[PDB]
Amino acid sequence: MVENSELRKAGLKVTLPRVKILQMLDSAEQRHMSAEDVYKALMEAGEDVGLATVYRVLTQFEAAGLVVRHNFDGGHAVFELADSGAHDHMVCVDTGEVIEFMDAEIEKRQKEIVRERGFELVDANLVLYVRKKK
Amino acid sequence: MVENSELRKAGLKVTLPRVKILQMLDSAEQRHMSAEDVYKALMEAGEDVGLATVYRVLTQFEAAGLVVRHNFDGGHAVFELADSGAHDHMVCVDTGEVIEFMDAEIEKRQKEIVRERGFELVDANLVLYVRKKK
Amino acid sequence: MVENSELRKAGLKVTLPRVKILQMLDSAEQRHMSAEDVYKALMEAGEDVGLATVYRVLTQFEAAGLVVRHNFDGGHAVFELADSGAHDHMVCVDTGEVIEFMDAEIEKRQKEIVRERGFELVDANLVLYVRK
Amino acid sequence: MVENSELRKAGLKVTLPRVKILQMLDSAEQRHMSAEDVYKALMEAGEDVGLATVYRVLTQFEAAGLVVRHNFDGGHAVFELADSGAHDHMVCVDTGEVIEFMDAEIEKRQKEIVRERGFELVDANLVLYVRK
Ligand SMILES: [Mn+2]
Ligand SMILES: [Mn+2]
Ligand SMILES: [Mn+2]
Ligand SMILES: [Mn+2]
Ligand SMILES: [Mn+2]
Ligand SMILES: [Mn+2]
Ligand SMILES: [Mn+2]
Ligand SMILES: [Mn+2]
Ligand SMILES: [Mn+2]
Ligand SMILES: [Mn+2]
Ligand SMILES: [Mn+2]
Ligand SMILES: [Mn+2]
Ligand SMILES: [Mn+2]
Ligand SMILES: [Zn+2]
Ligand SMILES: [Zn+2]
Ligand SMILES: [Zn+2]
Ligand SMILES: [Zn+2]
Ligand SMILES: [Zn+2]
Ligand SMILES: [Zn+2]
Ligand SMILES: [Zn+2]
Ligand SMILES: [Zn+2]
Ligand SMILES: [Zn+2]
Ligand SMILES: [Zn+2]
Ligand SMILES: [Zn+2]
Ligand SMILES: [Zn+2]
Ligand SMILES: [Zn+2]
Ligand SMILES: [Zn+2]
Ligand SMILES: [Zn+2]
Ligand SMILES: [Zn+2]
Ligand SMILES: [Zn+2]
Ligand SMILES: [Zn+2]
Ligand SMILES: [Zn+2]
Ligand SMILES: [Zn+2]
Ligand SMILES: [Zn+2]
Ligand SMILES: [Zn+2]
């Protein structure tokens, strides 16, 4: 996507680090990245952005809604482009593996539960902690 | 419930502060309490437990599974006795009001989504952020 | 008492809530406010900002460097303007009373420690948990 | 190298994972490990502890006072044995390099500040963010 239109969308001055990090997420191979993952990846692509900046920019992106922040294993923060796959996850509680899913039935029931009570749905989070039965 | 059987359940030496705080939760009027709420309430009932202890004991309880920890408004931690109502919440994103719900349809679909993929369900969290439409 | 100029240096478009929250933090300059505390105060003043809007603006400000975020008692987040005094606190473990202090000897020793190591000092944080 | 006696003082029943994780933290005493780092090491050693079990044990230890929890780079939690040295760190903002230091002048001034105020000192934390 057009990073510069997005940064204007979110009320954020277009600056070099903001554009480099957003390009990294857009083009990232792995969908769930730690702040350290983004910093390692920028080094790889030969971009000079310190870990402190990387985390601050991810925090602005989250607050602006560009990115969703999770804590699946409890011990480190995951950032994820804020698209519609970002809200439905199964977590293997023994390995830390994260698996996205989408079930139209559950998406529809969620809107029902909330309208029947006089509300509109702003946002849903569903996390399914799972174990491989055998 | 019998606090002392619970503390043994969870691998926790029975001590005065652990039993006072657990009695407070069991008998609390409000279901979602900050650490500050529990400390204020203990003062009220005329029990001498410092804020630092209160938070540490809640942290042990969470880790032992006796209590569930949420962050609904992003700005403060909520502790909640770990019963079956502790995993399904709507949050009014303008007021911070939290409302528990239970929908048997959604509970059943969640088990389906996970067995059809070779897993057993250890735990589910569902948070519905809502706005009062009018 | 409000500033769009503070927001610009931060690289942040000027908006109703950013301005209202920012001058709220300024016209209440030593309180150590939670997100809820800010939300309550705006309601008094008669603003209309949702609670989630408050917390997202305060997080934007933290990232931008306009505000410092602490968690003193473990339970709730404190948002403080990034002034001199915002990095040195004593904290009463039993009550959660928070108290800013500033000690020039301490602040001098910090810079010497760092200089004697070939580093420059970007920021320091000191928290003293105390009782009695 | 493992201790059920450490666990007892903490008020914690002695269990397989608590013991295995505890001696893992001891036989790797200056690493500043994440929950994942601990989980990986146990797998090497050939233990069988789930990742979520690791993190819950480390949280129990933090609450019990056996371990100190830091978040140095903002992104992941660090779990450190609560020894001397576990509360004073420099931190390279650009790389996340972490370095323990201890300075007796600083440690002396801290106790004077607190004493001159009628307080006793329960715990202090110093973090110096540095570059170059
Ligand atoms: Mn981790
Ligand atoms: Mn709050
Ligand atoms: Mn359904
Ligand atoms: Mn702080
Ligand atoms: Mn609190
Ligand atoms: Mn509090
Ligand atoms: Mn200072
Ligand atoms: Mn000195
Ligand atoms: Mn720390
Ligand atoms: Mn990280
Ligand atoms: Mn990290
Ligand atoms: Mn020290
Ligand atoms: Mn001195
Ligand atoms: Zn792009
Ligand atoms: Zn999450
Ligand atoms: Zn999440
Ligand atoms: Zn979501
Ligand atoms: Zn969804
Ligand atoms: Zn259905
Ligand atoms: Zn979202
Ligand atoms: Zn009871
Ligand atoms: Zn939650
Ligand atoms: Zn929750
Ligand atoms: Zn749950
Ligand atoms: Zn449920
Ligand atoms: Zn269904
Ligand atoms: Zn649970
Ligand atoms: Zn102005
Ligand atoms: Zn101040
Ligand atoms: Zn600071
Ligand atoms: Zn700072
Ligand atoms: Zn032993
Ligand atoms: Zn150490
Ligand atoms: Zn410490
Ligand atoms: Zn400590």
Structural domain boundaries in chain A = 1-83, 84-134
> CA geometry: angle at A11 spanning B94 and C21, to 5°?
45
**3-class secondary-structure state, position D106:** helix
Q: Which residues from D are below 8 Å from C126, CB to CB? A: 110, 124-126
**Chains touching chain C, criterion 3+ CB pairs below 8 Å:** A, B, D
CA distances for A102 relative to A87, A88, A90, B114, angstroms? 9, 7, 11, 12
Asked whether the beta carbons of residue D36 and residue A74 sit closer than 8 angstroms, the reply is no
Q: Which of A63, A6, A67 is nearest to C62 (CA)?
A: A63
Q: A82 pairs with which residues across the strands?
A: none
- Nearest CA of chain B to the CA of D132: how many Å? 34
Resolution in A: 2.3
Residue C40 · residue B96 · CB < 8 Å = no
Which of C34, C35, C52 is opposite residue B94, by nearest beta carbon? C52
The dihedral built from the CA positions of residue A58, A63, A65 and A71, taken in this order, carries a sign that is positive
Q: B91 pairs with which residues across the strands?
A: B98, B129
Largest CA distance in chain A: 53
CATH topology of domain A84-134: Dna Ligase; domain 1 (3.30.1490)
Distance of CA D121 to the CA centre of its chain: 19
Could you give the count of Cα atoms lying within 13 Å of D65 in the half-sphere of its Cβ?
10
Can you tell me which residue has the tokens 């780092």?
D37
Q: How far is the CA of B42 from the centre of ligand 21 (A)?
A: 14
Q: Which residues from A are below 8 Å from B129, CB to CB? A: 121-125
Residue C52 · residue B72 · CB < 8 Å = no
Asked whether the beta carbons of residue A62 and residue C64 sit closer than 8 angstroms, the reply is no
Can you tell me which residue has the tokens 């949420």?
B70
Residue A7 backbone phi and psi in degrees, to 5: -60, -30
Beta carbons within 8 Å of D86's beta carbon, 6+ residues apart:
D68, D80, D100
Kindly calculate the radius of gyration of chain A based on its CA atoms and give it in whole angstroms: 17
Q: How far is the CA of B126 from the centre of ligand 16 (A)?
A: 10
DSSP class of residue A39 equals H
Beta carbons within 8 Å of B23's beta carbon, 6+ residues apart:
B3
Q: Which residues from C are below 8 Å from A12, CB to CB? A: 11-13
Q: Which of D77, D101, D76, B35 is nearest to D68 (CA)?
A: D77
Residue D106 backbone phi and psi in degrees, to 5: -55, -50
Helices (H), A47-93: 51-63
Residue A116 · residue A108 · CB < 8 Å = no
Residue C103 · residue D113 · CB < 8 Å = yes
DSSP line for C48-77: ---HHHHHHHHHHHHHHTSEEEE-SSSSB-
| Chain B interface residues (partner D, CB cutoff 8 A) | 11-13, 15, 56-57, 59-60, 62-64
Which tokens in the block code for residue C27? 């016209």
Rounded Cα distance between D37 and D16, Å, is 19
Asked whether the beta carbons of residue D55 and residue A77 sit closer than 8 angstroms, the reply is no
Can you tell me which residue has the tokens 């666990």?
D7
Q: Which of A131, A127, A124 is nearest to A90 (CA)?
A: A127
Q: Which residues from D are below 8 Å from C121, CB to CB? A: 128-130
Contacts 24+ apart (CB under 8 A), B43-49: B47/B20, B49/B17, B49/B20, B49/B21
Q: Which residue of D has its CA nearest to C93?
A: D122
Q: A115 pairs with which residues across the strands?
A: none
Q: Which of C36, A74, C110 is nearest to B97 (CA)?
A: C36
Asked whether the beta carbons of residue B95 and residue C36 sit closer than 8 angstroms, the reply is no
Which of C127, C130, C132 should one mutate to test binding to chain D, selecting the residue with the greatest count of D CBs within 10 A?
Answer: C130
Which tokens in the block code for residue D79? 């779990």
Rounded Cα distance between D43 and C93, Å, is 38
Beta carbons within 8 Å of C118's beta carbon, 6+ residues apart:
D132
Q: Which of C24, C19, C18, C3 is nearest to C57 (CA)?
A: C18
Residue D17 · residue D60 · CB < 8 Å = no
Rounded Cα distance between B18 and D104, Å, is 37
Rounded Cα distance between A8 and A6, Å, is 5
Q: Which residue of B has its CA nearest to A93?
A: B122
Right CATH number for D1-83 from 3.30.2320.20, 1.10.10.10, 3.30.70.100, 1.20.1260.10?
Answer: 1.10.10.10
Residue C19 · residue C26 · CB < 8 Å = no
Rounded Cα distance between C109 and C105, Å, is 6
Residue B129 · residue B93 · CB < 8 Å = yes
- Nearest CA of chain D to the CA of C104: how many Å? 10
Q: Which experimental method was this entry solved with?
A: X-ray
Per CATH, the number for D84-132 is: 3.30.1490.190
Q: Which of A126, A59, A11 is nearest to B127 (CA)?
A: A126
Q: Which residues from C are below 8 Å from B38, CB to CB? A: none
DSSP class of residue C86 equals T
**3-class secondary-structure state, position C129:** strand
Beta carbons within 8 Å of C114's beta carbon, 6+ residues apart:
C120, C121, D90, D128, D130
Cα dihedral angle (A21, A25, A29, A31), rounded to 10 degrees? 140
Beta carbons within 8 Å of C2's beta carbon, 6+ residues apart:
C19, C20, C22, C23, C26
Rounded Cα distance between D78 and C65, Å, is 24
Which tokens in the block code for residue D89? 């760190």
Query: Which amino acid type is present at position A9?
Result: K
Rounded Cα distance between D67 and D61, Å, is 5
Which of C55, C93, C95 is opposite residue B75, by nearest beta carbon? C55
Cβ atoms < 10 Å from Cβ of B93: 20
Cβ atoms < 10 Å from Cβ of A116: 10
- Nearest CA of chain B to the CA of C43: how many Å? 11
Asked whether the beta carbons of residue D60 and residue B64 sit closer than 8 angstroms, the reply is yes
Residue B106 · residue A98 · CB < 8 Å = no
Rounded Cα distance between A109 and A94, Å, is 30
Q: H or E stretch including D81?
A: strand D78-81
Which of C50, C59, C73 is opposite residue B35, by nearest beta carbon? C73
Q: Same CATH fold, D84-132 and D1-83?
A: no
